[PDB]
Each structure stands twice: as structure tokens, then as C-alpha cells.
Scaffold this active site. Structure first.
Site, PDB file in Angstrom:
ATOM      1  N   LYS B 119       7.356 -24.152  15.150  1.00 51.47           N
ATOM      2  CA  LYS B 119       6.963 -22.774  14.888  1.00 51.47           C
ATOM      3  C   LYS B 119       7.661 -22.218  13.655  1.00 51.47           C
ATOM      4  CE  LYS B 119       8.054 -22.341  19.005  1.00 51.47           C
ATOM      5  NZ  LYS B 119       8.362 -22.071  20.431  1.00 51.47           N
ATOM      6  N   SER B 436      -2.083 -23.472  41.137  1.00 52.51           N
ATOM      7  CA  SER B 436      -2.128 -24.368  39.989  1.00 52.51           C
ATOM      8  C   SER B 436      -1.627 -25.754  40.371  1.00 52.51           C
ATOM      9  CB  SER B 436      -1.299 -23.801  38.838  1.00 52.51           C
ATOM     10  OG  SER B 436      -0.012 -23.409  39.284  1.00 52.51           O
ATOM     11  N   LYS B 479      -1.334 -28.778  30.979  1.00 52.16           N
ATOM     12  CA  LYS B 479      -0.988 -29.687  32.065  1.00 52.16           C
ATOM     13  C   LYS B 479      -0.942 -31.130  31.585  1.00 52.16           C
ATOM     14  CE  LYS B 479      -1.675 -26.053  34.830  1.00 52.16           C
ATOM     15  NZ  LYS B 479      -1.590 -25.196  33.615  1.00 52.16           N
TER      16      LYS B 479
HETATM   17  N1  LIG Z   1       5.350 -31.653  12.364  1.00 57.67           N
HETATM   18  C1  LIG Z   1       6.507 -31.291  12.960  1.00 57.67           C
HETATM   19  N2  LIG Z   1       6.625 -31.320  14.301  1.00 57.67           N
HETATM   20  C2  LIG Z   1       7.768 -30.964  14.907  1.00 57.67           C
HETATM   21  N3  LIG Z   1       8.869 -30.559  14.256  1.00 57.67           N
HETATM   22  C3  LIG Z   1       8.895 -30.488  12.910  1.00 57.67           C
HETATM   23  C4  LIG Z   1       7.683 -30.856  12.168  1.00 57.67           C
HETATM   24  N4  LIG Z   1       7.972 -30.692  10.866  1.00 57.67           N
HETATM   25  C5  LIG Z   1       9.254 -30.254  10.783  1.00 57.67           C
HETATM   26  N5  LIG Z   1       9.802 -30.121  12.005  1.00 57.67           N
HETATM   27  C6  LIG Z   1      11.192 -29.680  12.293  1.00 57.67           C
HETATM   28  O1  LIG Z   1      11.315 -29.083  13.584  1.00 57.67           O
HETATM   29  C7  LIG Z   1      12.386 -28.139  13.537  1.00 57.67           C
HETATM   30  C8  LIG Z   1      12.210 -27.045  14.581  1.00 57.67           C
HETATM   31  O2  LIG Z   1      11.447 -25.993  14.007  1.00 57.67           O
HETATM   32  P1  LIG Z   1      10.441 -25.118  14.903  1.00 57.67           P
HETATM   33  O3  LIG Z   1      10.096 -25.885  16.155  1.00 57.67           O
HETATM   34  O4  LIG Z   1       9.339 -24.682  13.973  1.00 57.67           O
HETATM   35  O5  LIG Z   1      11.267 -23.795  15.296  1.00 57.67           O
HETATM   36  P2  LIG Z   1      11.950 -23.620  16.740  1.00 57.67           P
HETATM   37  O6  LIG Z   1      12.931 -24.762  16.806  1.00 57.67           O
HETATM   38  O7  LIG Z   1      12.585 -22.252  16.674  1.00 57.67           O
HETATM   39  O8  LIG Z   1      10.799 -23.707  17.712  1.00 57.67           O
HETATM   40  C9  LIG Z   1      12.391 -27.596  12.116  1.00 57.67           C
HETATM   41  O9  LIG Z   1      13.732 -27.437  11.645  1.00 57.67           O
HETATM   42  C10 LIG Z   1      11.660 -28.637  11.290  1.00 57.67           C
HETATM   43  O10 LIG Z   1      12.548 -29.225  10.336  1.00 57.67           O
END
Ligand SMILES: Nc1ncnc2c1ncn2[C@@H]1O[C@H](COP(=O)(O)OP(=O)(O)O)[C@@H](O)[C@H]1O
Lengths: 532, 532
Positions: B119, B436, B479
Site C-alpha cells: 500500500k 461465514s 477466503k
Molecule cells: N509488488 C510488491 N509487493 C509487495 N511488497 C512490495 C512490492 N513492491 C515493493 N514492496 C515493498 O513492500 C514494503 C511494504 O510496503 P506497503 O505494504 O506498501 O506498506 P505497509 O507495509 O504499510 O502496508 C515496501 O517498503 C516496499 O518496499
């Protein structure tokens, strides 16, 4: 006044960075006026003096040999022989740093566990290996963002901050500053104190830190940072991130004896004055641990051996009838005093329907002597001791598991319509999340229903399953240490934890007997002297 | 006064509207005396910092391209192809509007998903797409309505809300601002900060956004917003209008391998300080993923790969033994801890009376290992787990199904008057409300009453009817992903969801072997196969 001239001569000679030079110019401008008719400027003078003695362009680089660094850390208050590897892991990280220059860009280090462990000695050893000037400022006494920052020179109440206090009596521009009791700051003024803490802990934003009392940047990037934790469940969330948690609970009998023989007792007799007229043996330390202090850490042992050393100093001062004073678990009433605890705490006239179980509190492990009063009634459940809801769910699960066996345990025709339960816990509010002693009070209820003598000295941790299973649990090392310190030599654990036992201190395994179970049936069979 | 001069120029070259120039000149007179002459000087300086350092009339070049953003979503991330399409929808809608047309009634993005599922990474990819600066500001841990805004601008010692400083960080009017963890917003003060966030998160009113600290309604119309939210149930209803939900459930195991190989592993390798002398086989990657991480996404994978990099720092730092060291599945515990999770759930050795449920707990997908028991009594149902009464209703529905189908399961024709059922549910409550896990409880009760082991490797979800007819359930993708993250690749689904097998990507149906059923008979035929 001569104060202005003295401060001008103190500032004009020290080589200073341009922004900090301008801030020194600002402070010198403030102290133009009287320093005797208004004490609001005297504290500014103290802040400036602390700022004058700040080292600049003078640092002590670490030893680039990571192996030699480990060799020096081998004297960090004996550590634990399993927690030092993560410290030297971070150190090795600091030997291939980002950009090939001194910078963290990562979690630094932390000590979590009881406060009685040697938190400061380990940091001192780190500084000794790295050659930097060790210093510590306790953040437990800081409840507001006003002792790491300040209050600008425009109103009364401008007391100096602890940051410059650490920056004052240090000779290296990048010291190691220890921050103990990081899990007690609350919101009193200027919002959450943890925001400034995370702003400081950033390797890139520490240089860009402008206090409430400061208006220019101050160099803090190369300054190594170190903290200490007591309870992990109380630390603010903005402090749980960017932090590599290193689990450092208390010590066993052997670890404490080694600490006393190498770090504690010689330092205590250093604190007590003369040396060479007292002696402490391993048996004395073992007896003191098993009869006088059941807590975790050596600070209680620090106080105890300090009392013993002071006593021996007094005996020598009043007359040297012996070359050295020795304790052999026989003359200890004179050295320490009357015993307070009971050796072999399980030897408390074992009753019929009571079991013992481990409950590792962050301040120190305890034994849960949970009693179950199976009075013949019509089906009731009295849950006392201020126990959590998950504890009640575990209790009902144990009840239905005991229901699952009608005549195997010699039980009567029924108890849901014939037995009223009054379950009492020494402290139901267990700090360990989840069911920590579900199997324990399950055994207690089974004993209260089977009405047979139960075995003692076996302390437990885990939970039950309605079809007779036990699930693996975390933090087994801390509870094993609790059993080791609490005079418990027999511990029952689920099978699935055994794979995790190959990363544990060998002294814990030596001092404890582990009998694994897979079903609640086995742990129930092996805890009553007769199987029924 | 040099500070007054600096503040005066900072007013001058920065272009604010004359409505704010009036405030600047009305605060000019408050600096006619020194700092100690009145504390109003310090608060005036602080207000000038908050006004003339926050940028005015500065904007980075907005990018208005729409396949370039597809490349960017492919450049940084391995590819979602579900969330990415909807982000394209929102971006294209923003592209066809937001000129001189006042049509900004569009909802603001909310990326509902478990922690660490892409995210903030998606946020920064989006920010790079339009060449906008990214400033994460975590709202988690905020319970005060005045933490979002400022306070009285009448004394020195208070700071404005998060927004003022956050946009002070950026030098242009229009940066992307990822609001975070908006679900944990509690009301531990006057009212609910939900409205304090609604006044800023809707374009029709934040264009004249007002906070307590500033006396000017600032324009936030040009500022892109994007909100993270681990939970959708606890999002306030006032903050649920003008919200479009972009669901991002967890990744998949082969997707996990791919994201590790493409970006994660090189990222952590250059993070530690290693630049291409370590080789890691895909088998080691899968071992890390399926043995040391159960959180949806890469955060745990980030930690484990950092550990790998740091142990590589060990074993290359003390000498370049090899040019490219290769790590297989065998030497992964030499670099990590003991495997804390099982390889596959097929080794579970199906248990007599337990069923494996499915749910999407807003902290990440997980199983619901619902267990029940069959004690010979008089007939009564007992929920345990502090869940809603709807689960008791589902259990009673399953009991009625067995009563109507007693000929099909070998039970005595009348058991409702002899067995007392303890439906122990592990978690405190489930987010995916309703039955569920109705078929899960049907399986559990059928196994318990018949004492026939149930296959603990097939994860399932679906409601039941009192006559027995499984019904469609929302979030079938949720799920399925929760089942996949549990190492489960055989899933029972309601046949009425046969339409919910094509909208899902082929990036989710890799190893999952959905065995659709339309009646309880089939879902109990798959599982209760053994008969000892
Ligand atoms: N395609 C991807 N799928 C999952 N994680 C990724 C991807 N590309 C980069 N990341 C890494 O996942 C880490 C977590 O970020 P994110 O999941 O977006 O925010 P949060 O950890 O707050 O949910 C980021 O620091 C990033 O470097």
C-alpha cells in the site's frame, strides 16, 4: 560583569561549526544583560557551558576487526552467551555499512527484559570495543518533551536538557548514549513524547533536530544510539518500529555465579573500599539465589553482595581475625540475615486438588498455586483472582475435556450437576498474553475431581485442547529461566517446541528436566501419584 | 534584529494571497521588542515559521499520462492486475477532470488491506507516476480531535496538527499524502476526530480547510489524498461516504517468490552492504516464505531477508571465501532460526473432531481452527470464544441438518437429547460476520458426533440452510487467499459461487483446487471419508 567576558573567551577559542557558531553568538548576545538581577539567564549560561564542552571534530573510531569486537564484548557482564550474537550481528552490519560510511539506516539495538540485568555494563563493553565514550541518561525520569529539549530564553523555567548533558561530559563527537526505562512516558505536555524519540532515532534526522531551546541544526548523525526496554507491551508503537528486539531475560544459577566471580563481587568490594579480605564461593551464591532472591537479574544480587562486602569491611575494620571472610551457606545469617523465602517452594504440604504452573512476568517469573474447590453442589463456576477471559475459556475447555473421560480418571457419574467450582489464582491477571497456565489449572481441576494427591515441583506453561492436545507456545526460554530461578527442576512442555530448544543456553538444559507431553492425558497421569 | 530581517524576507519572496499578507503585517508589529521582553515574540516567530516556510504558489510538474502509470506499476511492483486496473480507473477519472471544471465529487481512495501488502509501496509508485512527492503521515494512535488541527494561536508551546508540518516538509502545493491506519481512530476526547478528518478528506470543504493554529483557510484542493486502512468495519460512517474501496488482500506463494526475486532480495542485499557476491536459490526463497512468515505480504519477508543479508555480512565479512555463495533449502537454518511453521498442512494427520475454517481478519488472513466436543449429556449447545449468536444459530442449523440426515452418518436416530456440544472458537470474534464458516461448523459437529476424523488440510467457507443448501458468500477471493497463505491448496466452495471463479485472476488459482459443492452432503462427503 566578568561572566560575559569569560563566556566570550570560552567561545572565541573553541573551533565551532558555522551554524553552531551563530547559535553561540546568539547565546552570547543574550548574556549581554545582567546575570545577577534575573536568574533566567544563568540557566542559559549553564546551557552554553554545557555546549562549550561539546566535542567537535574529535571522535574515536571503532575497531574494524569484528572478531576483536566480539572478543571485547566477551566481557559485557557475561551477557547470556546467546544474546551477544545479535549484538555482534548488528556490529558486523556496522562493518559493511550503507554507502561505506558510518551510518545506521536500520534498527540500532535494544535490551528487553527485567531491569535487574546488567544493561549498563553491556553498553560499557560496547563502548570499550568501539573506543567511544560511554554515557547514559535515564528516560524514565523524563515524562515530558522538555528534558531532551528545552524552553527558549524568554520566560522562567529554562532548565537544561539531558541531550546536551550527555553531550557535555563526552570527548567524542559520536558517543554512545543509553536510554533506560523507555516504556513509561505518557502524554502530559506537547503531545506524545515518542514522536521526538523517533525523530532522534532516525540516522538522518538527528542532525536536523532543532529543540524547543535550539534554533540551529546540531550534529548527531554519527552519534550511536542505544535504549533499554522493560515491558514490551507498554512501549509506544512509534517505538516498536525501527528497533531490533533482543530478548535478554534474567540469569540462571551458573550465569549469576559467573557474573559474581567475574563482574559483580570484585566491583562490589571496589565499592565497599578495601580488597583482599573477603571471599564468596559458588555455594554461597547458589544458596542466596535459592533462598533470598527469586527475582530475575543481578541488581538484587548486587545489593545483597554489597551488603555482604560492607559487613566484611566492618569486620576487618573492627579486627582481622581471618585473612579473608568466606561464606559457605552456614555463616550466612551473620553476613546477610534471617532467610525470607523458602527453599524448595513446592514443599508446602502438597494438597489434593492443587497444581503449580509457570507464569513469566516481565519483572520476574512466578509459580501459580491455583487451588480448585470441588465442593459437591449442582454445577457452578466461581472464577476469582482477576483472571482474563481467555483463562476462563481455557477453564471451560479443561472442564469439557474432563467431561470427555467418564470413568478413566475414577470420576463420579457426573459433576456438571454435582460439583461447584471455586477456582482461585495467585494472580489471574497474567501479563503473558493468551493462556499461559491452562494445562496447570486443568490439572488442578482434575486433581480436585479425582481427589488424589498431586505431584509438586513440576511447573508448567501451555494450553489444553478439547480432544487432548497441546499447542506450541512462544517465549519458552523466559519461562524456563523462571522455572530455573524459582527452584523448579521439572518442566512439562509440548512436543512441537522441542525443535526450538536447539537455540537455548546449555545451563538451562542442565539445570532443568524436560518431560514432553502430547495429550492432556499424559500430563494428568504423570502428576498424580496414582493414575486414577 | 537579524531574526526579524530573516522573517521579513521570508514573508517577502514567498507569495501568499493578500488575505494572508494582512496577517503577516498584523504579526509584524508583535516583534517590536526582544525575545525576553515578551513571550509573544517567540510565538510570533513560531507562527511566522508555520506560515512563511509552508510553501505557497509552488507546484511540481503534474504528469497526465495513463499507460506510463501502467509501466510504473509494472516497474516497481511485480504486478497485481486487479488493484492496478482500479487505480487506473481512478487515475483516468482524475485525468478527464480536475481542470477548470468544478466536478470534484469523486471519492478519495482507501486501500483496505492487511499490513505490509503493498500500500505504501503502491502509494509511492502512484506518486512517482505523476511526479509528486510522497509524505506518509501515520494517523494510528490519534484519539484527540485537536491532534488533526492545531490549537489556540495565543501562546507559545503548542504545535499545529499533522497536516501543517507534513505539508511544510514538501516545497510544493500538491504532494501525495498517504493517510494511514485510519481504522484505529478512537474517540477519547470531545467528540470523534472522524469529522476532523472529514473536513480535510473531502474536496468540496478542504479547499477552505481550517485548523485552530492557522487563521487562514488553506487550500487543499490540489493535494492528492490516499488512505490506508487495515479495517473497513471500524471506518467511521461520516468518513465512509465519498470513499471508494480498493481491496488489496494478501499475495500468493508464487507471487511471493516472484516479488522476492524481482525487488525484495536485491533491495535487502544492497541494504546490508552486499553487492552481488551472494546467490539464493528459489527453493530457499520458498522455504523462507512458507516456514518463517505467516503475515500477508512482504513485511515479514523483509525482516527475514534482512536477517539473511546480515548473516551473509557475517560469512563474507571475515573473508571473501567465494565469489558467489549459493544458499539452498538445506543451509537456511544456518542463517535463520528453527523453522517455526510447517512446510505444508497435508501433514496434519486428520484429527477426530476439528475443522479448518476460513476468514479474513483485518490484520491478515488466517484459519479458524474451530473445534467442538461431544459429551454424553441431555442436549444443549454452548458457544465458547465470545463470538456472536449467529455462530450458535449456524451450529444449531448444522445439528438440524444431521437430525434430518441421521441415516447418512451412522448416528443413532435420536442424539439431540444425549449430547452436549461445546463449540470452542479460538479467536475472540470474527470480522467476516454471519455464517461465514457455516459449512466449517457443519463439518466440525459431524466429525465430533460421529467420531470420524476430518481432513485438516482443506480450507473451506460457506453458509448453510436449515434444510441444507449452501449459499453464496462475499469476498471469495479473500477466503481463497487466506486459505493459500495457510499452505492450503484444496478449498471447498459453494457451487452458487461458480460465477466467482472467473473474475478472479489466474494469479490466484495456481495451486488452489476448488471443489465446488451445492449441498452439505457433498462437503461432508469430501471430508468425513475415514471410518475407523
Ligand atoms: N509488488 C510488491 N509487493 C509487495 N511488497 C512490495 C512490492 N513492491 C515493493 N514492496 C515493498 O513492500 C514494503 C511494504 O510496503 P506497503 O505494504 O506498501 O506498506 P505497509 O507495509 O504499510 O502496508 C515496501 O517498503 C516496499 O518496499
Amino acid at each position: 560583569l566578568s561572566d560575559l567576558e569569560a563566556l566570550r573567551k570560552k567561545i572565541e577559542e573553541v573551533g565551532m561549526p558555522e551554524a553552531v557558531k551563530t547559535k553561540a553568538l546568539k547565546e552570547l548576545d543574550r548574556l549581554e544583560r545582567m546575570q545577577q538581577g534575573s536568574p533566567e539567564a544563568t540557566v542559559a549560561r549553564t546551557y552554553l557551558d554545557w555546549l562549550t564542552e561539546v566535542p567537535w571534530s574529535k571522535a574515536d573510531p571503532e575497531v574494524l576487526d569484528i572478531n576483536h569486537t566480539r572478543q571485547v564484548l566477551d566481557e559485557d557482564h557475561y551477557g547470556l552467551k546467546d544474546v551477544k550474537e545479535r549484538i555482534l550481528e548488528y556490529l558486523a552490519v556496522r562493518q559493511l555499512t550503507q554507502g561505506l560510511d558510518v551510518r545506521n539506516k536500520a534498527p540500532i539495538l535494544v535490551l528487553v527484559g527485567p531491569p535487574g540485568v546488567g544493561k549498563t555494563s553491556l553498553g560499557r563493553s560496547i563502548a570499550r570495543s568501539m573506543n567511544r565514550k560511554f554515557h547514559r541518561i535515564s528516560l524514565g525520569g523524563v515524562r515530558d518533551e522538555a528534558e531532551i529539549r528545552g524552553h527558549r530564553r524568554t520566560y522562567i523555567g529554562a532548565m537544561p536538557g539531558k541531550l546536551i548533558h550527555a553531550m557535555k561530559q563526552v570527548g567524542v563527537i559520536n558517543p554512545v548514549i543509553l536510554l533506560d526505562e523507555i516504556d513509561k512516558m505518557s502524554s502530559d505536555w506537547r503531545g506524545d513524547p515518542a514522536s521526538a524519540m523517533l525523530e532522534v532515532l532516525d540516522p538522518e534526522q538527528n542532525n536536523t533536530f532543532t529543540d524547543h531551546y535550539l534554533d540551529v541544526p546540531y550534529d548527531l548523525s554519527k552519534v550511536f544510539f542505544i535504549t533499554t526496554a522493560n515491558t514490551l507491551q507498554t512501549i509506544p508503537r512509534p517505538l516498536l518500529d525501527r528497533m531490533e528486539v533482543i530478548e535478554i531475560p534474567g540469569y540462571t544459577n551458573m550465569e549469576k555465579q559467573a557474573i559474581a566471580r567475574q563482574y559483580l563481587w570484585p566491583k562490589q568490594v571496589r565499592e565497599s573500599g578495601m580488597e583482599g579480605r573477603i571471599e564468596v564461593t559458588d555455594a554461597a551464591i547458589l544458596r542466596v539465589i535459592s533462598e533470598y532472591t527469586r527475582e530475575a537479574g543481578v541488581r538484587g544480587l548486587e545489593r545483597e553482595l554489597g551488603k555482604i562486602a560492607r559487613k566484611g569491611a566492618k569486620f576487618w575494620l573492627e579486627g582481622a581475625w581471618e585473612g579473608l571472610r568466606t561464606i559457605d551457606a552456614s555463616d550466612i545469617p551473620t553476613y546477610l540475615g534471617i532467610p525470607r523465602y523458602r527453599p524448595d517452594k513446592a514443599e508446602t504440604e502438597p494438597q489434593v486438588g492443587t497444581a503449580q504452573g509457570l507464569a513469566w512476568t516481565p519483572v520476574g517469573g512466578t509459580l501459580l498455586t491455583i487451588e480448585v474447590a470441588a465442593v459437591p453442589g449442582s454445577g457452578k463456576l466461581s472464577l476469582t483472582g482477576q483472571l482474563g477471559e481467555v483463562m476462563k475459556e481455557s477453564a471451560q475447555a479443561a472442564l469439557t475435556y474432563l467431561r470427555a473421560h467418564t470413568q478413566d480418571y475414577g470420576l463420579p457419574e457426573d459433576f456438571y450437576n454435582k460439583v461447584d467450582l471455586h477456582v482461585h489464582v495467585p494472580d489471574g491477571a497474567t501479563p503473558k498474553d493468551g493462556p499461559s497456565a491452562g494445562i496447570t489449572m486443568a490439572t488442578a481441576i482434575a486433581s480436585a475431581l479425582s481427589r488424589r494427591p498431586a505431584r509438586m515441583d513440576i511447573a508448567m506453561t501451555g494450553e489444553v485442547s478439547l480432544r487432548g492436545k497441546v499447542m506450541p507456545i512462544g517465549g519458552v526460554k523466559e519461562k524456563l529461566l523462571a522455572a530455573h530461578q524459582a527452584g523448579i527442576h521439572k518442566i512439562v512442555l509440548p512436543k512441537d517446541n522441542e525443535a526450538q530448544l536447539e537455540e537455548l543456553p546449555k545451563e538451562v538444559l542442565e539445570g532443568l528436566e524436560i518431560k514432553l507431553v502430547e495429550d492432556v492425558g499424559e500430563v494428568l497421569e504423570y502428576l498424580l501419584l496414582p493414575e486414577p
